[PDB]
Paper text:
The S1 subunit comprises the N-terminal domain (NTD) and the receptor binding domain (RBD) with subdomains SD1 and SD2 undergoing hinge-like motions that promote RBD movement between closed and opened conformations. Engagement of the RBD open conformation with human angiotensin-converting enzyme 2 receptor (hACE2) triggers a large-scale conformational rearrangement in the S2 domain, which contains the fusion machinery necessary to mediate viral fusion and infectivity.
To better understand the molecular basis for the improved breadth and immunogenicity of S2D14, a more extensive cryo-EM dataset was collected for high-resolution structural analysis using a Titan Krios 300-kV electron microscope. The 23 total mutations (20 PROSS designed mutations, D614G, K986P, and V987P) present in S2D14 are all well resolved with clear side chain densities. However, as shown by DSF, the overall thermostability of S2D14 is the same as S-2P, suggesting that this loss of energy is well compensated not only by the formation of additional hydrogen bonds but also by the VDWs and electrostatic mutations that are introduced.
Author numbering:
A (entry chain C): 710 to 828, 853 to 1147
B (entry chain B): 612 to 623, 641 to 676, 688 to 709
C (entry chain A): 856 to 953
D (entry chain A): 1002 to 1050
E (entry chain A): 710 to 758
């Protein structure tokens, strides 16, 4: 017959990092195998159309990268500008809004993030730039964040007007199971906790270096793959030498053809392996990008009831920040802290009828009986407005005997 | 011509972009929605005034403004 | 021939211990669980609170508790018997090994 | 050639198994530690436990 | 102008099975191809890495 009910709460902010895209690479098939040689080029035509297939596969990967970025970041086509009055009921948003005093319109946290990720042409290998520059990504993120902060639950519906921030916070408090008066009576403490958590995240980013391992792994894997592809160009494969010019300048065509054939087979195998593994890695990255888009649309533009989908605890808000080849989310949650013991009962018997609470639980502190809500302690008198009646007092296991008050009799007496 | 310098482009209405050398397009400074993507934020489209192809920097959308109150 | 199979990091006993701890915590702590300062919450109150989340009032559970428990126990026993008889339940796990 | 074929097919199968494991983790966190309102995500009917 | 409303209920329990992991395998490349032979081992170095 015991129950524990929190008597306090704290505001918590955590982070989450998701890869979105990877580097775009184009390769010349003939230049890699038979770079600047006519005998090798004429021998290559006997093998059909391998080069076209490899080029097509790489091109499809390159297109899919830009599709991933476009799906993740360009969700809303309205551009919202930074509010000129930084009054949000005491909430500090300076460390995540764009810095007007810098040439690069990045926030402080984005600047910190973009300084923690670090970092062969004549072999036919080229890297070509992405369609959206970093400034455009930052602008999309900034517009999204500013619109979410200022327009509240209106946002994309148009005809937007500045909705006060505390009203949004109260409305999202209501979606957890806590009444608005808690926020409206603890606003200053809530804002203080929020600001402290943001500062703590900033310091943690400024000190620790291993935060972005998820984003570093992709770069490392791609670089290693390219390095292996380049190094496979010095192998012998059973010929007399690994240089086409040498064998062309030394031997006659009839046997040069045989040894050039050996070299050609080796180079073709290397290219095939590289392309296949790139295809598999691209599939994995696409799955990650789909997850990121779902996360953005379900956590930044609304409240989520799914457990642990937006960090630990009860979800309140989340804000996006851009990172190299990725995105960072900042989840804000509600965490009850201080628990106390009480005695509880399932029903109250008053005059031959059983009473159940409309919302919450019946709670006892030793002598009196009250009714509260589960997530915050706020006792009040048990009346006929808090409860409803069903049946008699002989079926419920564990019923009590006292006592329901009527808020009408004093009025009728007077 | 991808990743090339126009001064000098021996392999080659001439404009040097961040994506390479572009030949046959006229440069403007009015932003629009992307029609044919080139790369590095540059987009191209043909429209009326006949057979004229233009190159411009991409636009991210229509600006929106709200009245600020409390 | 150069082929070796090497063991997993977590033994089966550790997996079973994790599962048991998870189940016991869920059963005893109710909606508190991971928040700490855990105290035994009565199970029937958890069942009533989850009945409320479907669209049914608590009095239904508090007036049909015994029948509900009987049905639950019968269903658990039926699952046990079905596992004890049928052999093709775990084809999903058998396919990977094959 | 034999070794190459074996390794490639193992890689693909590993990707599939990883997707299944992600589904299992989501199922655990959304059905064992809370109630789910998603239809047919936790069996047929209205989910209780 | 008709509607149907239940007058009873039943409790149902079902099962669901999900794979999580598979077997871990390590292979020696040279021992598979050129097991205990020096001529084969020296010929293998011509193929790179
Ligand atoms: C629910 O949980 C909240 C959250 O913790 C708690 O209520 C507040 O708890 C905080 C600490 O957790 C209290 O803060 C401390 O208050 C002490 C007394 O406050 C007086 O002195 C400060 C001095 O600046 C005045 O500003 C204030 O107006 C009061 O006159 C202070 O001694 C503490 O300050 C010292 O430590 C801080 C660092 O923590 C230093 O920066 C200071 O310089 C100084 O050295 C500290 O400020 C706070 O008073 C509590 N009440 C509030 C915010 O109203 C409880 O745990 C709980 N509340 C419940 C159950 O009601
Ligand atoms: C919540 O919002 C408020 C405004 O509403 C912010 O307050 C200002 O924040 C800025 C940015 O941090 C502060 O500017 C800083 O000034 C420092 C020098 O002055 C401070 O320190 C001296 C003591 O040396 C004090 O006497 C003085 O009063 C100030 O307190 C600079 O040194 C800082 O630059 C350093 O940090 C930045 C971090 O970005 C580095 O990039 C620099 O290279 C350098 O190392 C900085 O410019 C300003 O002082 C704050 N105002 C007040 C009144 O304190 C809060 O920062 C904001 N908080 C959060 C968590 O969002
Ligand atoms: C919660 O509240 C309810 C109602 O307020 C309580 O239920 C009553 O409990 C009292 C005891 O505290 C019961 O009183 C006793 O009833 C005995 C049975 O007689 C009644 O029941 C029969 C059933 O066949 C009827 O036919 C008959 O007409 C009566 O209505 C009596 O025999 C008892 O009398 C004896 O003991 C008393 C003790 O003082 C002596 O003075 C007498 O001389 C005699 O020796 C006694 O009167 C009462 O019947 C209960 N009501 C009902 C409706 O069941 C719960 O007990 C209470 N629970 C808690 C935990 O507080
Ligand atoms: C709900 O919870 C209750 C306890 O709160 C459980 O009740 C006991 O369960 C155990 C386990 O099944 C029972 O132990 C069994 O005893 C059998 C022998 O005694 C029974 O049978 C004779 C008739 O032969 C009766 O006279 C006697 O009263 C008992 O009913 C053993 O033979 C059993 O072992 C066999 O089954 C097990 C299954 O695990 C096999 O592993 C064995 O190899 C062997 O084949 C078993 O040990 C105990 O009897 C139950 N108590 C009572 C009072 O009946 C319920 O089982 C539990 N139900 C569910 C669905 O969870
Ligand atoms: C809503 O749905 C429920 C769920 O089915 C139903 O209400 C119950 O319905 C079941 C039948 O499905 C009833 O079970 C049967 O009850 C008969 C009468 O019960 C008396 O006899 C038993 C004998 O043990 C006593 O224990 C009991 O207390 C009563 O005095 C019994 O004859 C049946 O027992 C026979 O079959 C079982 C196997 O089913 C054997 O184990 C027995 O040994 C015996 O051979 C059986 O117990 C149950 O009684 C109903 N309960 C209630 C509260 O209604 C209805 O369909 C529906 N209820 C509504 C609308 O109110
Ligand atoms: C919850 O806390 C209360 C204290 O408020 C505990 O009450 C104690 O109960 C033990 C016996 O169980 C007594 O010996 C103590 O004197 C009680 N303390 C007080 C201050 O009254 C209660 O036990 C706790 N809950 C549980 C389930 O143990
Ligand atoms: C805790 O229980 C005590 C009784 O032991 C309550 O004290 C009385 O409460 C009533 C109404 O709440 C007041 O009218 C009395 O004046 C109180 N008496 C004393 C001596 O203070 C107390 O209210 C209970 N508190 C909670 C939060 O349940
Ligand atoms: C490619 O062209 C660019 C022009 O955008 C060159 O960059 C400048 O080139 C001029 C002369 O061509 C130099 O005086 C400047 O110092 C260069 N600026 C920078 C920042 O380097 C670039 O040098 C050309 N590259 C090659 C290989 O010719
Ligand atoms: C839009 O482009 C025109 C080019 O036709 C710009 O006109 C030139 O601008 C540069 C500096 O940006 C000057 O050095 C030239 O002398 C200008 N040429 C002429 C003929 O005026 C024009 O300035 C651009 N618009 C803006 C707002 O920068
Ligand atoms: C919302 O609309 C009301 C009117 O419907 C605006 O009230 C205007 O306020 C300005 C001063 O700020 C006055 O000059 C106008 O005369 C008012 N309009 C009317 C019809 O009286 C209100 O300003 C609008 N909201 C915001 C945030 O601007
Ligand atoms: C808005 O109203 C609040 C009081 O509700 C006041 O403190 C604040 O100064 C006002 N700001 C503006 C810009 O009107």
């Amino acid at each position: 017959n015991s129950i524990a009910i929190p008597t306090n709460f704290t505001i918590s902010v955590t982070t989450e990092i998701i890869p979105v895209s990877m580097q775009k690479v184009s390769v010349d098939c003939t230049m890699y195998i038979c770079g600047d040689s006519e005998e090798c080029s004429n021998l290559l035509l006997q093998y059909g159309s391998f080069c076209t297939q490899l080029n097509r596969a790489l091109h499809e990967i390159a297109v899919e990268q830009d599709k991933n970025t476009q799906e993740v970041f360009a969700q809303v086509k309205q551009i919202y500008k930074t509010p000129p009055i930084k009054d949000f009921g005491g909430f500090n948003f300076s460390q995540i809004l764009p810095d007007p005093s810098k040439p690069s319109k990045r926030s402080a946290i984005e600047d910190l993030l973009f300084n923690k990720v670090t970092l062969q042409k004549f072999n036919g290998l080229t890297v070509l730039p992405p369609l959206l520059t970093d400034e455009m990504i930052a602008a999309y993120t900034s517009a999204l964040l500013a619109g979410t902060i200022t327009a509240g639950w209106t946002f994309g519906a148009g005809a937007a007007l500045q909705i006060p921030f505390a009203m949004q916070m109260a409305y999202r408090f209501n979606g957890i199971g806590v009444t608005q008066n808690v926020l409206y009576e603890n606003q200053k403490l809530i804002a203080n906790q929020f600001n402290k958590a943001i500062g703590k995240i900033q310091d943690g980013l400024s000190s620790t270096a291993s935060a972005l391992g998820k984003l570093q792994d992709v770069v490392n894997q791609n670089a290693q793959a390219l390095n292996t592809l380049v190094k496979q160009l010095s192998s012998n494969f059973g010929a007399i030498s690994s240089v086409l010019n040498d064998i062309l300048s030394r031997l006659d065509p009839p046997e040069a053809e045989v040894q050039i054939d050996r070299l050609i087979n080796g180079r073709l195998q290397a290219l095939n392996t590289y392309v296949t593994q790139q295809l598999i890695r691209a599939a994995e990255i696409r799955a990650s990008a789909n997850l990121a888009a779902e996360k953005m649309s379900e956590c930044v533009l609304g409240q989520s009831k799914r457990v642990d989908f937006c960090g630990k605890g009860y979800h309140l808000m989340s804000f996006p920040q851009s990172a190299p080849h990725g995105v960072v989310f900042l989840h804000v949650t509600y965490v009850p802290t201080q628990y106390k013991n009480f005695t509880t009962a399932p029903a109250i018997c008053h005059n031959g009828k059983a009473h159940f609470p409309r919302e919450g639980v019946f709670v006892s502190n030793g002598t009196h009986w009250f009714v509260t809500q589960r997530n915050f302690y706020e006792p009040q008198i048990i009346t006929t407005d808090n409860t409803f009646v069903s049946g008699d007092c002989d079926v419920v296991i564990g019923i009590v005997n006292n006592t329901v008050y009527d808020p009408l009799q004093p009025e009728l007496d007077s | 011509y991808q990743g090339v310098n126009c001064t000098e482009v021996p392999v080659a209405n001439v404009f040097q972009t961040r994506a390479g050398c572009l030949i046959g397009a006229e440069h403007v400074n009015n932003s629009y929605e992307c029609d044919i993507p080139i790369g590095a934020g540059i987009c191209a489209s043909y429209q009326t005034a006949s057979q004229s192809i233009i190159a411009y920097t991409m636009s991210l959308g229509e600006e929106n403004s709200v009245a600020y109150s409390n």
